[PDB]
């Protein structure tokens, strides 16, 4: 990995292979790990670079705990900035890493070739689209969530392998550990469940996805949607999946698994991101 120092914190990321950027961004509470067996299908046909969010995987820390969804778009942007990665970039992003890739989207779309999607924010939620996480996600946005998610790191030791349908290995859950040692580490996972805009709330994050959500229904930059059965966000029946069906110049793959998608089909999810970018860079 590189780092680079972006704001007041340092971004940690993947960078291999050469030629326009491919940039992958994950959610929570993941790292570039979430991509391994995902991007060697895809580094001898582009430069593929996956950056560890602020308080995340192998990156810095905020030193004002400022892990807010616009706190994040501005690490990121300055990542962007540092590594110079503004032109012809296909997105490949995942959960809170597609709000982060669809926003930069909406603010730069000269930059974007394409957008490859999967288990993503495509719009605001209503709590009928968690269908079985809507428990677990409506106490976490309680006062429960201080417990739940950093006293007990439910994300980590629950959430992760309750979204594989295969069994993690040992190793895997070690890794996606790591950055969360402590109580105090885990903030930034509480943070993303209590910034999703759900129904109108937080407002600031809802209208920012709003508005990337209009866009995107408008855009004609290239998209590529991976679904996942059964999947998580987006599942069949789902109004988050209806809307995303509806985005212009877009073409879909299935896939198996369930939220975390990568862990159970991560080459045929390689395979179709690959050929997806080889047809971009056709144009």
């Not at 560890?52 to 616009?70: C, E, K, N, Q, V």
């Not at 778009?73 to 032109?87: N, Q």
């Not at 009928?128 to 996600?137: K, N, S």
């Not at 991976?226 to 069949?236: K, M, N, R, S």
Request: hydrophobic fraction near 40%; proline fraction near 7%; charge should be negative.
């Amino acid at each position: 990995m590189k780092r680079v120092d972006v704001l007041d914190s340092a971004m940690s990321y993947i960078d291999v292979g050469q030629g326009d950027p491919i940039v992958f961004l994950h959610g929570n509470p993941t790292s570039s790990y979430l991509w391994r067996n995902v991007i060697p299908h895809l580094s001898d046909v582009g430069r593929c670079l996956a950056p560890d969010l602020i308080g995340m995987g192998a990156s810095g820390t905020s030193p004002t705990f400022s892990y807010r969804f616009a706190d994040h778009v501005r690490y990121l942007d300055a990542w962007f900035e540092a590594v110079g990665i503004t032109e012809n970039v296909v997105l490949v992003v995942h959960d809170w890493g597609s709000a982060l890739g669809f926003y930069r989207a909406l603010r730069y779309p000269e930059q974007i070739a394409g957008i490859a999607y999967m288990d993503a924010l495509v719009q605001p939620r209503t709590w009928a689209g968690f269908t079985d996480y809507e428990p677990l996600m409506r106490a976490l946005r309680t006062e429960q969530g201080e417990r739940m998610a950093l006293a007990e790191n439910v994300f980590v030791e629950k959430v992760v392998p309750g979204g594989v349908q295969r069994q993690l290995t040992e190793e895997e859950m070690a890794v996606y550990r790591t950055p969360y040692p402590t109580p105090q580490s885990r903030i930034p996972t509480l943070l993303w469940a209590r910034e999703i805009p759900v129904e109108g709330e937080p407002a600031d994050v809802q209208a920012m996805v709003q508005e990337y959500a209009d866009f995107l229904s408008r855009s004609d930059i290239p998209k590529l949607l991976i679904v996942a059965e059964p999947g998580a966000i987006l599942h069949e029946g789902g109004s988050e999946l209806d809307f995303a069906r509806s985005w212009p110049n877009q073409r879909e793959v299935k896939v198996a698994g369930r939220h975390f998608l990568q862990e159970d089909s991560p080459d045929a999810i390689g395979a179709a991101v690959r050929a997806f970018v080889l047809d971009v860079r056709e144009r």
